Curated annotation (Swiss-Prot):
Name listed for the protein in its UniProt record: D-alanyl-D-alanine carboxypeptidase
Role according to the record: Removes C-terminal D-alanyl residues from sugar-peptide cell wall precursors.
EC number(s) reported in the record: 3.4.16.4
Impact noted for substituting K36H: Almost no activity
Cellular compartment(s): Secreted
Organism annotation: Streptomyces sp. (strain K15)
Top enzyme category: hydrolase
GO cellular component: extracellular region
Length: 260
């Protein structure tokens, strides 16, 4: 068994559900941005899901990332961005503005505030449907909250569930994506290229997911997945000490998991 800096860790064979590694796997901790995995999952499971549907970037999304010093996809106010593009903006450059956009889009309600509340409700309903007992969401992006938490095991189960969707799989294994959006005047804008924050995609052979996360309370987190020898290991590390540390943690856990 490898030693990891993360205070929370879990990994399983995604195909069989068999546990490969544990470290306070059922201890509740802050998720940081890894909560976005649930946002993606809820969006992709919407009955009225239309990946080509366009969303107008609201001033609110921009003001939000600023007010919360949140990571962003740099979506431009006024631009018309598709749900697909938003999913890439959400999962690759850790776009909290993209997360807000998706929550506003798929939440039910007559105001942004109402739809955001509704969307977070759908996230919690999703957790409940998965049979989770140690996860609660109070945000669509993991932005600060004692009421926003999960566990290495719960997050891994959420990720596994999300990975059942081919679109989610395609998005999370994408290293780079350049969104061509539609401006206020109708022209096509080539946004600056988005790079997946998940360094494993290039450093770990066979890596296929899933999503990074960070926060003042959550520290450095990472939900990871990889396939080697026809075996897929999926797991989560919570509260590692740094970005390099969380990547080594994940690399060690997967290596261990494939050697078991």
């Amino acid at each position: 068994k490898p030693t990891i800096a993360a205070v929370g860790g879990y990994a399983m064979n995604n195909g069989t559900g068999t546990t490969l590694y544990t470290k306070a796997a059922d201890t509740r901790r802050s998720t940081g941005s890894t909560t976005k995995i649930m946002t993606a999952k809820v969006v992709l499971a919407q009955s009225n899901l239309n990946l080509d549907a366009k969303v107008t970037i609201q001033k609110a999304y921009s003001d939000y990332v600023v007010a919360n010093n949140a990571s962003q996809a740099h979506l431009i106010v006024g631009d018309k961005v598709t749900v697909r593009q938003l999913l890439y903006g959400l999962m690759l450059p850790a776009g909290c503005d993209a997360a807000y956009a998706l929550a506003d889009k798929y939440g039910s309600g007559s105001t942004r505030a109402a739809r955001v509340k509704s969307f977070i409700g759908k996230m919690n309903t999703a957790a409940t449907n998965l049979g989770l007992h140690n996860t609660h969401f109070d945000s669509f992006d993991g932005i600060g909250n004692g009421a926003n938490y999960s566990t290495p095991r719960d997050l891994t189960k959420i990720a596994s569930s999300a990975m059942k969707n081919s679109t989610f799989r395609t998005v999370v294994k994408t290293k780079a994506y350049t969104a061509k959006t539609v401006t206020k005047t109708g022209s096509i804008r080539t946004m600056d290229t988005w790079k997946n924050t998940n360094g494993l995609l290039s450093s770990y052979s066979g890596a296929i997911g899933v999503k990074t996360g960070s926060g003042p309370e959550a520290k450095y987190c990472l939900v990871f997945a990889a396939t080697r020898g026809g075996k897929t290991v999926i797991g989560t590390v919570l509260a590692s000490t740094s970005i390099p540390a969380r990547e080594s943690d994940a690399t060690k856990i997967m290596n261990y998991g494939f050697a078991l």
